Design a protein around this nucleic acid. Structure first.
Lengths: 79, 109, 78, 92, 73, 94, 82, 81, 95, 93, 109
DNA sequence: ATCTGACACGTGCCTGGAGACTAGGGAGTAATCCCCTTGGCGGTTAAAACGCGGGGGACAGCGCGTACGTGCGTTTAAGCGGTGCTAGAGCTGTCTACGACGCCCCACCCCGATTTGCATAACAAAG
DNA sequence: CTTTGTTATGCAAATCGGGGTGGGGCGTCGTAGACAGCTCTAGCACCGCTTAAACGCACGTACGCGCTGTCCCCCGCGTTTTAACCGCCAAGGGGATTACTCCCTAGTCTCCAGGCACGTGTCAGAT
């Protein structure tokens, strides 16, 4: 009975993990159509996707900082 | 709190902080020969309370600056703009905390 | 032969997945430097992407706003 | 492997500000904070036990250490919260 | 007999005072001289109290032998 | 040309708002190594140990300047002098 | 063999520190006085950090040795450890 | 008991100032000095009482004062400890 | 005959620096200590040695404050001490 | 009921340094508190060093280190020499 | 150090006046560590004795300067405050009935 | 034909925590005694309180004069990215010298008399 | 008036002895750390290029400093008054102690599950 309990809990744990894989898979545009994407690909491309998005944040914040500096200089000129 | 339904000691106390870890830490460092069963529970509750108090203020500071993330600047403001925390942590240097924007009137036009 | 080879292929498959989990785990600040289950890594990556998506959208909004403010100030300056 | 409270800080922050994150530098600061407060209270409780010729630290020594270490409202609230947590734990 | 002992000590103390005055010594000088003779350098307070009979009979009995040598010297 | 003190106030607001270190890193490292060399030769430092020193040092000097400024104001002056630093350190007990 | 790296702290560096402190005007004698004070501060912190390092029979000074050196002087530093 | 702060008279304040090397005292010092002393006593007494209550004692002893002062960075010699 | 002002002040400074006795009378000091203690908790008792310990610390504290207060007045190029000098000394000290 | 103190040892040291000089009871009470304060400071520092290095035994090395940290200047130098001398002679046959 | 010792007492073996056995006991009762090395209390006793001697020597000199044959708290205060190393070590210490140094500034004259 | 990679099933497997007793020690409780705190009372006198007159220092205003701030052009080295090298930080395994701990006996320390000088003051003389 | 030694004595401190205990051997044993070895992290030395920050100098002027003058308000002194202090007394209460007793944590062991990876079945697209 304990063996059976372990078997089903582990069987469900795999299915729960698969659902977590799908939740991540569906969230990455690169894997949007890849319904059969394997676990290894999802993790590798999720990593690459997040890193590229983080790189985008660094680009965006740099532009924001430059624009804030420009705003202050323009106000100074008006004064 | 209203109820408890858990095996975990931290959950029984209704705390997020790890009671079992605090218990081990109280034994470490030779603070005493013996530690009371309720000792780590009381202490964990205090650590959590103070932690929540700082985070709440720091989060408010983040909103004031239109930020979605807490940074060391916010922690510095949260503490230095609060008399009780300022007394408790008045000797503490916070990395990249900065300083309050205080300028004396005699220096102004 | 074939079974032992299959075992080796399966071991390699798991090893790639395990390393990929670690790389993904270190990509999310909530798990960076911390122990996490396979499921937690996936769940944090999922919400973190959603966070970063709206965060970068928010950054672009601030960029557009500052650009428009600068355009107005430049118009006053000229 | 090293121990830290970052996982618990994350949980507390989520409960207080569900839509606010924390930087890694801020997290390092919060860990320094927790370790500092722990040492202060544990050290003070040790002194109190020593002064009273006691060998066991209980909630009374910790409560006293809190009254001595925390100012103003923080001492009042920390004591109330500590007492409440122990009461629940005892009945839980 | 404690009273007989008291009288003997009183008689010595009176003779001691007379010897000190006759020789032109101070009470301090007596104590200093005992220091030379025995190594025990008494202050004027001990000598004054001895002459004034402020010391117990036991103390006078114990110090007397040293003072007797002082009288001889 | 701006009236003198106009820029100084702008700089005060700028530096109070910002959190970055004001002392250049390489010059500081040389100073730390120069001093450490007088206690023991052939010492090495973690890069984080140097940052820890910079943070403590600037926080220390800035706090001292704030007290120094108060002394100058008490003396009914705007300009800070060595006299004000020495008083602040004397009261602190340095 | 390092010498005279105290000059690595330039006037602008001192001016910026003073400005953060809310100082509006700085006497020309401050720069020299400031360097003297900083040198003393570093000597006291470094001496302890090195002492901790030597006690442990290590040759490398770690961040924790600096943290202990500072904590020991009543100046607790956060973010570099506890 | 009420308003026993007046028990600290001007001459007592002046004499303390004399050890400090003060030649001249403004008339506002006396009130400021009393305010400062009251705060100092409250901080030391509050802690000494806290120690006393913790120990389940009805009386404050010198050691409670010494511990109260020790925590403020003011070590006192000659009263025990 | 009369002494020039400041002659006595110097005499008193030298006299009180030389001496070691308490300057605050004990009885009114006791009343002050008891009044404060009654606010934290009622019906408290004190050992006479506890009161002496408090007074010794208090006088040492106030004298140290006056020494720093005097320095502030000197820095301000004044002889007379004002509340400003006390408040500055405390603010720099960190009280 | 017995109360322990170092007054006998303080007395003996004074007797060796200034054989013709006595000591008041108030001065002795001060010296006794002095000894207890220094003892606590060194023992406390030594404890911290053992903890920081995750060691459980305190030896002369921790104390020597604590002395170097706690005492300034020459005073530290002499204290270390005296400590080293006492241990060396103690263990020597 | 001493060439030899005949007394069984550990303090005598070390050539010290301070009690090694008591120092050893206190280190074990104060819970400073789980274990205390045999040489630990010997080193420490030597340090306590050294510092004690330095204060007593200066205090004794102060007594002689004041034409007194007995050390009083006033002398101890003078002994500490007139010595830079001791003044740094005990700078925060208040000595009962110690009084203060007779410091007169030129601006007062 | 079979190779590679993938999902998924059987089943041990590490560790982390909580659960369950269990003995021996600490802490709680009750009784009792005696030192020390609180409180009161009367006398006396040292210190605080109060008024006042004078003079010394706080403070406002004025005028120099020079040391400090502000641009502006030119020089310097900080900072960033990249390369290569190895000292030593950090971990693990072996094994012994060393400190905890139990037990016993006497020389050494505590404390209560008990003796005995220190500092200050009354009692005379001397230029 | 100022200076000085003689002796008086109140009282704090140095000395003595008797007895109780904790320091020091002594043996035993478990383990903390001393020491050797090995991996591989990150600290250091070097290089070239970019460019922001640092440096030197001309030029005004805002602010520090010295002086004058006025006037508030603090000091010193005399005279009155007021509580501090000192000596003595008794009441009782609470702090220290000793003897029980019970309950509570260090210690050891048991065991349950929750993520984790070894090993096996298999199933379709690719060599």
């Amino acid at each position: 009975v304990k063996r059976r309990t372990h078997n089903v809990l582990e069987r469900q744990r795999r299915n729960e993990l698969k659902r977590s894989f799908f939740a991540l898979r569906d969230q990455i545009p690169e894997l949007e159509n890849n319904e059969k994407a394997p676990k290894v690909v999802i993790l590798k491309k999720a990593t690459a996707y997040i890193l590229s998005v983080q790189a985008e944040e660094q680009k965006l914040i740099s532009e924001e900082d430059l624009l804030r500096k420009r705003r202050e200089q323009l106000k100074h000129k008006l004064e | 709190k209203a109820r408890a339904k858990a095996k975990t000691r931290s959950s029984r106390a209704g705390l997020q902080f790890p009671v079992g870890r605090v218990h081990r830490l109280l034994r470490k460092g030779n603070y005493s020969e013996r530690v009371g069963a309720g000792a780590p529970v009381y202490l964990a509750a205090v650590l959590e309370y103070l932690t929540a108090e700082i985070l709440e203020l720091a989060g408010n500071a983040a909103r004031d600056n239109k930020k979605t993330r807490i940074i060391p600047r916010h922690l510095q403001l949260a503490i230095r703009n609060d008399e009780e925390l300022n007394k408790l942590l008045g000797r503490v240097t916070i990395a990249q905390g900065g300083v309050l924007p205080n300028i004396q009137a005699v220096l102004l036009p | 032969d074939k079974r032992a080879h299959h075992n080796a292929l399966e071991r390699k498959r798991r090893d790639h997945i395990k390393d990929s989990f670690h790389s993904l785990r270190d990509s999310v600040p909530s798990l960076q430097g911390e122990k996490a289950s396979r499921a937690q890594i996936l769940d944090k990556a999922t919400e973190y992407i959603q966070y970063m998506r709206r965060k970068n959208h928010t950054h672009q909004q601030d960029i557009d706003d500052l650009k428009r403010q600068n355009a107005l100030l430049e118009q006053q300056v000229r | 492997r090293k121990e830290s409270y970052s996982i618990y800080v994350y949980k507390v922050l989520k409960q207080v500000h569900p839509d606010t994150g924390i930087s890694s530098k801020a997290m390092g600061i919060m860990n320094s904070f927790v370790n500092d407060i722990f040492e202060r209270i544990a050290g003070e409780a040790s002194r109190l036990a020593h002064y009273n010729k006691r060998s066991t630290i209980t909630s009374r020594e910790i409560q006293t250490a809190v009254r001595l270490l925390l100012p103003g409202e923080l001492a009042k609230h920390a004591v109330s919260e500590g007492t409440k947590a122990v009461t629940k734990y005892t009945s839980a | 007999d404690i009273k007989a002992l008291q009288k003997e000590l009183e008689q010595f103390a009176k003779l001691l005072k007379q010897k000190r005055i006759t020789l032109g010594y101070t009470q301090a000088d007596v104590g200093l001289t005992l220091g030379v003779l025995f190594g025990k350098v008494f202050s004027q307070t001990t000598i004054c109290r001895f002459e004034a009979l402020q010391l117990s009979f036991k103390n006078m009995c114990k110090l007397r032998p040293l003072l007797q040598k002082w009288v001889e010297e | 040309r701006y009236r003198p003190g106009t820029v100084a106030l702008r700089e005060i607001r700028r530096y109070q708002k910002s959190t970055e270190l004001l002392i250049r890193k390489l010059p500081f490292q040389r100073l730390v190594r120069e001093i450490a060399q007088d206690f023991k030769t052939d010492l090495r430092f973690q890069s984080s140990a140097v940052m820890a020193l910079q943070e403590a040092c600037e926080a220390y000097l800035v706090g001292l300047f704030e007290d120094t400024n108060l002394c100058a104001i008490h003396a009914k002056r705007v300009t800070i002098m060595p006299k004000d630093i020495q008083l602040a350190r004397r009261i602190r007990g340095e | 063999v390092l010498r005279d790296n105290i000059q690595g702290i330039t006037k602008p560096a001192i001016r910026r520190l003073a400005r953060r402190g809310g100082v509006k005007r700085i006497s020309g004698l401050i720069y020299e006085e400031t360097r003297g004070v900083l040198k003393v501060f570093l000597e006291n912190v470094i001496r302890d950090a090195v002492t901790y390092t030597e006690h442990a029979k290590r040759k490398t000074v770690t961040a924790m040795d600096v943290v202990y050196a500072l904590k020991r002087q009543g100046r607790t530093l956060y973010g570099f450890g506890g």
